[PDB]
Amino acid sequence: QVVLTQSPGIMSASPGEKVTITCSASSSVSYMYWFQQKPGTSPKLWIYSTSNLASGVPARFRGSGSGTSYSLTISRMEAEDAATYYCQQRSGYPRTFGGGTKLEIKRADAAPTVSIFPPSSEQLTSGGASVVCFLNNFYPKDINVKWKIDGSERQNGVLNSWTDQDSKDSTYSMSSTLTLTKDEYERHNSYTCEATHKTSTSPIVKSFNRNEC
């Protein structure tokens, strides 16, 4: 029941820049332990005993700390390193972790890739129409959808889901699901999704006509 409090809650770092994370124990302990975790994934032991990289870990991670404020340092940041880092104290029982700290890598501006989708045959069969439009592989993470129907903005029935950055190229990626009914789908003809991201002034639009046009 020691309380670990990891300093920055989320930070952003540039390729090859110095990352330095803090963790801080509510009461002196022998040793901190760090694990890296990555969205979708179990966590893994990244350092232990205050400063021994667990087999696996790049030598860029320097494990440090003593007594009551501890800290994990990435020498020169890579894009693999983008993940959360959890500290843990094996001081007694209970073991105890922390906040976490979301490192993010910070690549370059990289505009999205829109592609819109008519509801399925078999959606329309069951009595529902969802018109989903994926916005893919942009950066920054700030991006924007207008769902215009017959050339006018229906503002309701929208859900935007975002991915975390990508593994390979480190991008942000959002889906956007326009969700109406059979009847309603079918009262109108043009359906347009349009994406406005800092990447460019002129919004991106992919679109359809509900007749096949």
Add this chain to the structure above:
Amino acid sequence: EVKLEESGGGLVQPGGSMKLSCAASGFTFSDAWMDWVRQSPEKGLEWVAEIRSKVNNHAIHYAESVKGRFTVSRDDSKSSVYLQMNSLRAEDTGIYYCSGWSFLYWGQGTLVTVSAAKTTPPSVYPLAPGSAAQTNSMVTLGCLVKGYFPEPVTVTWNSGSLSSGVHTFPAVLQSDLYTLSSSVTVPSSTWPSETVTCNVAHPASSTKVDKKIVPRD
């Protein structure tokens, strides 16, 4: 080489019991102290129990939160550790990792949800581009996997062959249901020139391997 597959995860209605199993291989199981360590997004990362090797005579240790309701046990003899969750609780909810040496190896976790709701197979709709599409260098398709409960649902494409440049998104919550979509991009020439199928499952024991097919006239 060292392999932890927990299993047993589920919907439990409050007050209900559940057993988590965790099977190890890759190492001298008899030799390892074990932990259950459970994760949520609100709570986060919070240790659950610990269970020492025969050498240190199976000394047991729980978080106060769980003291009295969960029951960790092993069978050194089957190379497996267990969590017999009991008298459960909407908070007891989250990802349950069965874990390594003193925290050094880590199975992939089961989702476990206690909650009054029931199962809700997801609906699987293919998102094929459009009977008047533009087909440029590249090509994107989709699965709409809809209105399921409980989490999670596991989507791969081509039972895993097609695994590059494909975005599955986080679930969102609607009429307290879950809706999630995955996109995949293949080079133009490759579709519908070769079959892209997207397979999904949700423990609801639905398991739909629906084929993303082009749309007529």
Add this chain to the structure above:
Amino acid sequence: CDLRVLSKLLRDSHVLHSRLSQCPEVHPLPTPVLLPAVDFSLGEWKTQMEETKAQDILGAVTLLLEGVMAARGQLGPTCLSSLLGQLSGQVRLLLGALQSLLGTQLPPRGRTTAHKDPNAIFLSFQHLLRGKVRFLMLVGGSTLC
């Protein structure tokens, strides 16, 4: 509450080693095993707290087990094996002892050397038993009975 222990381990160990000298056709290893090196001057070392010092040993020790299994690993139901057996059991008790103490299991670490020679493992054990062990649990050192 014993110090019967280290003293008893040592000799129990040495007994193992001896019994090997005369099994049937006794030979090296296909594959080198890594056992915890034979560090020599424990200088930099005994300056340091009793805790890190313990970890190292539990560290080495866990490595020692790995080496030794690694070596049972290798061969069939033979007499060295059946002994590497009883050895590994032995090594195991310390492992406890030190896990017991630091109250966690650390992972294998510290500088090792590759040994085909099945003795060099029996050895490696005793070396920590006589060095880094004894040299630990003297000075206060709340060790494990």
